[PDB]
Amino acid sequence: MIQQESRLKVADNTGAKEILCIRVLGGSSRRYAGIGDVIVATVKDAIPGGNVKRGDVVKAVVVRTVKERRRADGSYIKFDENAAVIIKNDNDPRGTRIFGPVGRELREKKFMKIVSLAPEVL
Amino acid sequence: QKGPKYTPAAEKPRGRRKTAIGYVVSDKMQKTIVVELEDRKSHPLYGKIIRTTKKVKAHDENGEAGIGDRVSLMETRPLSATKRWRLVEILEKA
Amino acid sequence: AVKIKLTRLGKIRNPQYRIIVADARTRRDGRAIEVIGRYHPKEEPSLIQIDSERAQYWLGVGAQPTEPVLALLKITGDWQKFKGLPGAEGTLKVKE
Amino acid sequence: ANIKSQIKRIRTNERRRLRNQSVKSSLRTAIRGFREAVDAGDKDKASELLHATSRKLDKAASKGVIHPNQAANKKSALALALNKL
RNA sequence: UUUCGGGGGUACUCGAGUGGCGAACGGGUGAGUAACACGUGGGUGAUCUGCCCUGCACUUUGGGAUAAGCCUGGGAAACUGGGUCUAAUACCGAAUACACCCUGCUGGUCGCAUGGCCUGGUAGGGGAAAGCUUUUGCGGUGUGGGAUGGGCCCGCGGCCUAUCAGCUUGUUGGUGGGGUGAUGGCCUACCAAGGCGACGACGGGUAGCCGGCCUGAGAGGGUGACCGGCCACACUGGGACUGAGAUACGGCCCAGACUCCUACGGGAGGCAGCAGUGGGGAAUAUUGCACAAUGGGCGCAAGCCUGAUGCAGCGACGCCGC
Ligand SMILES: [Mg+2]
Ligand SMILES: [Mg+2]
Ligand SMILES: [Mg+2]
Ligand SMILES: [Mg+2]
Ligand SMILES: [Mg+2]
Ligand SMILES: [Mg+2]
Ligand SMILES: [Mg+2]
Ligand SMILES: [Mg+2]
Ligand SMILES: [Mg+2]
Ligand SMILES: [Mg+2]
Ligand SMILES: [Mg+2]
Ligand SMILES: [Mg+2]
Ligand SMILES: [Mg+2]
Ligand SMILES: [Mg+2]
Ligand SMILES: [Mg+2]
Ligand SMILES: [Mg+2]
Ligand SMILES: [Mg+2]
Ligand SMILES: [Mg+2]
Ligand SMILES: [Mg+2]
Ligand SMILES: [Mg+2]
Ligand SMILES: [Mg+2]
Ligand SMILES: [Mg+2]
Ligand SMILES: [Mg+2]
Ligand SMILES: [Mg+2]
Ligand SMILES: [Mg+2]
Ligand SMILES: [Mg+2]
Ligand SMILES: [Mg+2]
Ligand SMILES: [Mg+2]
Ligand SMILES: [Mg+2]
Ligand SMILES: [Mg+2]
Ligand SMILES: [Mg+2]
Ligand SMILES: [Mg+2]
Ligand SMILES: [Mg+2]
Ligand SMILES: [Mg+2]
Ligand SMILES: [Mg+2]
Ligand SMILES: [Mg+2]
Ligand SMILES: [Mg+2]
Ligand SMILES: [Mg+2]
Ligand SMILES: [Mg+2]
Ligand SMILES: [Mg+2]
Ligand SMILES: [Mg+2]
Ligand SMILES: [Mg+2]
Ligand SMILES: [Mg+2]
Ligand SMILES: [Mg+2]
Ligand SMILES: [Mg+2]
Ligand SMILES: [Mg+2]
Ligand SMILES: [Mg+2]
Ligand SMILES: [Mg+2]
Ligand SMILES: [Mg+2]
Ligand SMILES: [Mg+2]
Ligand SMILES: [Mg+2]
Ligand SMILES: [Mg+2]
Ligand SMILES: [Mg+2]
Ligand SMILES: [Mg+2]
Ligand SMILES: [Mg+2]
Ligand SMILES: [Mg+2]
Ligand SMILES: [Mg+2]
Numbered sequence: 001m002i003q004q005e006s007r008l009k010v011a012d013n014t015g016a017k018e019i020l021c022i023r024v025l026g027g028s029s030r031r032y033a034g035i036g037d038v039i040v041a042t043v044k045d046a047i048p049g050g051n052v053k054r055g056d057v058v059k060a061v062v063v064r065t066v067k068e069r070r071r072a073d074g075s076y077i078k079f080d081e082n083a084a085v086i087i088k089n090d091n092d093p094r095g096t097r098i099f100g101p102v103g104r105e106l107r108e109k110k111f112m113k114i115v116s117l118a119p120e121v122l
Numbered sequence: 123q124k125g126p127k128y129t130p131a132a133e134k135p136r137g138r139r140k141t142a143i144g145y146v147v148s149d150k151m152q153k154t155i156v157v158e159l160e161d162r163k164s165h166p167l168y169g170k171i172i173r174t175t176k177k178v179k180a181h182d183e184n185g186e187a188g189i190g191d192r193v194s195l196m197e198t199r200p201l202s203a204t205k206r207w208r209l210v211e212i213l214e215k216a
Numbered sequence: 217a218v219k220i221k222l223t224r225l226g227k228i229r230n231p232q233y234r235i236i237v238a239d240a241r242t243r244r245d246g247r248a249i250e251v252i253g254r255y256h257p258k259e260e261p262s263l264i265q266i267d268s269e270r271a272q273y274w275l276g277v278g279a280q281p282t283e284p285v286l287a288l289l290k291i292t293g294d295w296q297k298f299k300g301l302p303g304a305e306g307t308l309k310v311k312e
Numbered sequence: 313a314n315i316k317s318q319i320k321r322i323r324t325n326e327r328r329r330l331r332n333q334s335v336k337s338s339l340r341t342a343i344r345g346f347r348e349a350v351d352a353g354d355k356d357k358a359s360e361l362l363h364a365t366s367r368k369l370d371k372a373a374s375k376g377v378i379h380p381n382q383a384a385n386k387k388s389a390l391a392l393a394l395n396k397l
Numbered sequence: 398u399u400u401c402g403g404g405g406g407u408a409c410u411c412g413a414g415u416g417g418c419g420a421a422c423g424g425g426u427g428a429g430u431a432a433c434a435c436g437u438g439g440g441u442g443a444u445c446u447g448c449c450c451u452g453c454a455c456u457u458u459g460g461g462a463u464a465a466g467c468c469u470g471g472g473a474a475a476c477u478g479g480g481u482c483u484a485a486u487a488c489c490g491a492a493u494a495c496a497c498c499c500u501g502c503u504g505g506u507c508g509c510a511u512g513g514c515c516u517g518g519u520a521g522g523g524g525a526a527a528g529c530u531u532u533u534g535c536g537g538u539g540u541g542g543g544a545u546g547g548g549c550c551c552g553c554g555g556c557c558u559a560u561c562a563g564c565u566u567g568u569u570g571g572u573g574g575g576g577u578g579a580u581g582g583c584c585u586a587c588c589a590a591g592g593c594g595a596c597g598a599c600g601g602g603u604a605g606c607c608g609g610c611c612u613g614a615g616a617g618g619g620u621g622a623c624c625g626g627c628c629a630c631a632c633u634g635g636g637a638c639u640g641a642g643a644u645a646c647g648g649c650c651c652a653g654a655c656u657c658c659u660a661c662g663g664g665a666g667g668c669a670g671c672a673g674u675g676g677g678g679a680a681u682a683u684u685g686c687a688c689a690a691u692g693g694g695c696g697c698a699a700g701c702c703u704g705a706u707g708c709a710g711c712g713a714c715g716c717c718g719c
Contacts, residue, residue: 120661125453126496127539136442136509140552150591151570159552166554167617174596196509197551199443199580202570204592206550208510217449218545222691224706225624231707233691239545240448241422244692244705245625249545257690277544278450284691318648321420321639325649329638363522370498370524374538381444381578384498387523389575391500
């Protein structure tokens with residue numbers, strides 16, 4: 001559940017704190033974004049010594065969503081804040097260390113570095 | 123080779139704590155007075171004599187000191203912040 | 217427990233040692249109460265000098281020397297005078 | 313914690329901490345009892361409780377957990393408070 | 398003894414485990430700090446102090462348990478739990494103390510004021526030990542005497558800047574309580590309103606201080622290489638236990654950033670110690686040998702440890718000789 005003008009947390013150490021969603025990707029009239037969906041987001045504020053400055057247009061993948069998302073066993077996900085991970089063209093993060101947990105859907109979505117490096121997978 | 127329980131440390135009398143005389147200028151508290159001391163020194167570089175004064179506040183138990191009097195002072199244990207003195211005696215009253 | 221120390225001074229290729237009465241736990245070159253003798257073995261005879269009166273006073277009041285200090289002041293004769301078993305013997309060899 | 317001696321003294325300090333905390337808490341409870349008694353305003357029971365507190369403080373001070381002069385100062389204050397009240 | 402798988406005593410010896418001692422010693426750096434932080438000068442009638450030496454009492458008695466070991470579980474790992482069981486200079490009572498530590502009543506000296514000293518006198522209450530070795534013998538509890546070590550308060554001193562004029566509310570002062578080894582807004586409550594301020598307060602920038610070094614006849618100016626006396630810190634910020642003694646560097650706990658291991662269930666770190674590597678730079682050394690001498694720790698000694706220290710290797714960088 002990430003839409004246009006959606007206001008998100010950053011779970012990276014790239015130097016950015018807060019991002020605004022730009023579009024949700026995946027197809028024509030793409031409407032919602034779920035865990036493991038690559039999107040495009042813009043940086044609203046950042047660490048002064050951060051790698052990325054505010055105003056950049058950067059591709060991102062959402063990892064922490066407030067809305068329930070079911071799994072194959074009926075497992076529904078309610079997190080506490082909408083967060084995304086800054087990603088580059090090579091399907092890799094821009095940061096080196098991650099805040100907070102992650103969902104299993106990233107593993108099936110081939111994103112291996114994030115799921116491996118996260119402190120715990122849930 | 124036995125005996126009782128006396129193996130002490132060393133003695134020490136009580137000696138000198140620095141004495142001074144100055145003028146009291148403010149008595150608007152009770153039981154405390156501020157005293158200005160007069161000090162004369164030759165300047166280390168110029169050598170010319172310079173007159174400088176400092177204000178030090180002491181302790182009195184009755185508030186018997188009025189404005190514009192001179193008294194003698196002795197050093198003591200700290201009693202509060204920024205006061206470390208007591209009053210000796212009032213020799214003159216104005 | 218004040219002990220008789222040997223304080224290091226000077227530079228590298230010649231060690232220095234000062235027979236100083238001071239507290240034990242301090243630094244090797246730490247605070248010095250009184251200087252009574254100096255020790256330096258680099259020279260050929262390695263002449264040794266101790267102030268007998270102050271050394272005797274410190275031994276009486278209770279300064280405990282280390283074994284090398286005890287041996288050196290025995291060479292000087294301070295230990296012999298203090299204990300009184302042989303007497304006071306002077307055998308130290310003077311510079312040529 | 314990298315030396316065997318260091319970790320051994322860590323364990324020793326832990327067990328000393330437990331023992332001394334127990335002793336200190338016991339003395340604190342005795343002082344609390346005295347304070348409650350003097351707040352209530354008793355005389356005789358306060359007297360025997362003062363004797364017990366003085367005993368326990370003196371043993372603690374001779375055992376080194378608390379300084380003898382501080383124990384004496386506390387106990388003298390106890391006696392003075394009893395005298396005034 | 399033996400079947401060479403090993404089975405018994407020995408204390409010469411000893412892995413690991415209890416119990417002490419050291420560990421706050423010795424070495425390092427100058428980020429913060431304009432402060433009793435530094436030097437000098439005294440101080441304590443207001444403190445304490447293990448190991449050292451030395452004049453002077455005693456060291457009676459009873460009880461229980463645990464590590465270790467054995468069995469077992471989790472788990473790659475660190476590490477832990479459950480059950481059985483053992484001794485001590487490990488642990489706790491009780492017997493003396495009458496010379497100490499407290500409270501109430503009565504003298505002389507000193508003044509520097511409470512009051513101190515003359516252990517003043519007085520009535521009541523309270524207070525500790527552990528033994529080993531048979532040999533140059535060391536231990537346990539207390540303080541009339543000395544010394545070291547500390548902690549605290551102060552006269553005085555020492556950068557620039559009003560293009561920094563008001564600052565402060567436990568702030569200031571008194572009383573009563575707690576507090577600490579010691580007095581104290583060190584902390585609390587109640588009373589009053591002021592203290593510090595143009596003989597530069599509060600603000601802003603810089604910086605460890607001093608004996609010293611260079612220059613200058615001197616005054617003065619510059620400066621803090623080495624050594625040495627203190628100060629402050631140990632990746633950043635805090636907090637506390639232990640102990641006669643803590644900013645506790647290689648002690649503890651927590652929060653951060655970085656790094657590392659994993660069998661993904663979780664753990665380990667702090668070279669500004671001696672060497673060495675990466676980066677910055679103009680650039681600054683060798684992953685060297687020893688306790689021979691001396692200081693330091695342990696032990697009755699023998700003896701053990703000590704990048705403290707002695708030495709060696711590199712570099713015309715400097716005072717000096719060839
Ligand atoms: Mg004695
Ligand atoms: Mg004595
Ligand atoms: Mg030292
Ligand atoms: Mg010779
Ligand atoms: Mg020896
Ligand atoms: Mg308790
Ligand atoms: Mg409590
Ligand atoms: Mg103690
Ligand atoms: Mg007291
Ligand atoms: Mg009182
Ligand atoms: Mg053994
Ligand atoms: Mg010790
Ligand atoms: Mg230590
Ligand atoms: Mg240390
Ligand atoms: Mg250095
Ligand atoms: Mg350095
Ligand atoms: Mg500094
Ligand atoms: Mg300042
Ligand atoms: Mg000690
Ligand atoms: Mg007994
Ligand atoms: Mg057992
Ligand atoms: Mg038995
Ligand atoms: Mg008993
Ligand atoms: Mg008895
Ligand atoms: Mg009696
Ligand atoms: Mg008598
Ligand atoms: Mg015993
Ligand atoms: Mg012994
Ligand atoms: Mg002074
Ligand atoms: Mg000064
Ligand atoms: Mg008070
Ligand atoms: Mg008082
Ligand atoms: Mg105070
Ligand atoms: Mg109060
Ligand atoms: Mg000078
Ligand atoms: Mg000149
Ligand atoms: Mg000049
Ligand atoms: Mg200077
Ligand atoms: Mg030095
Ligand atoms: Mg000093
Ligand atoms: Mg720190
Ligand atoms: Mg700090
Ligand atoms: Mg610390
Ligand atoms: Mg260290
Ligand atoms: Mg270290
Ligand atoms: Mg470090
Ligand atoms: Mg080093
Ligand atoms: Mg470089
Ligand atoms: Mg060079
Ligand atoms: Mg040695
Ligand atoms: Mg022998
Ligand atoms: Mg060894
Ligand atoms: Mg060795
Ligand atoms: Mg060398
Ligand atoms: Mg060159
Ligand atoms: Mg060359
Ligand atoms: Mg030459």
